[PDB]
Curated annotation (Swiss-Prot):
Keyword Transport on entry: no
Other noteworthy facts: Skeletal muscle troponin C binds four calcium ions.
Chain positions found as Blocked amino end (Ala): A1
Family: Belongs to the troponin C family.
Keywords, alphabetical: Calcium, Metal-binding, Muscle protein, Repeat
Function: Troponin is the central regulatory protein of striated muscle contraction. Tn consists of three components: Tn-I which is the inhibitor of actomyosin ATPase, Tn-T which contains the binding site for tropomyosin and Tn-C. The binding of calcium to Tn-C abolishes the inhibitory action of Tn on actin filaments.
GO cellular component, one term: troponin complex
MF-aspect GO terms: calcium ion binding
GO biological process entries: skeletal muscle contraction
Sites where the protein binds Ca(2+) 1: D30, D32, D36, E41
Domain EF-hand: 17-52, 53-88
Residues of the full protein shown: 2 to 91 of 163
Name of the featured protein: Troponin C, skeletal muscle
Protein residues bound to Ca(2+) 2: D66, D68, S70, T72, E77
């Protein structure tokens, strides 16, 4: 019954103690209660760096990490992102 191997793999790698470390910084990113992020809400935290983004450019940014269809970035997708680099060296 292995169809969603994508995120299923990141869940087994990251325990409850490690998942908690991201729990705090997860709601920070969203800022809409803490359930699922978006392309607009995300653009805000990204700006903190020191640049000037746009609505059109943000939709391409997520287009990278959004190979599902939903369009949002729920807790059951953010963990798959960070996990990708964790693998070996990346
Ligand atoms: Ca939201
Ligand atoms: Ca998604």
């Amino acid at each position: 019954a292995s169809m969603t191997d994508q995120q299923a793999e990141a869940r087994a790698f990251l325990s409850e103690e490690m998942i908690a470390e991201f729990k705090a910084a997860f709601d920070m990113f969203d800022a809409d209660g803490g359930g699922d992020i978006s392309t607009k809400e995300l653009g805000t935290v990204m700006r903190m760096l020191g640049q000037n983004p746009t609505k059109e450019e943000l939709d391409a940014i997520i287009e990278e990490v959004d190979e599902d269809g939903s369009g949002t970035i729920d807790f059951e997708e953010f963990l798959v992102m960070m996990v990708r680099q964790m693998k070996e060296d990346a």
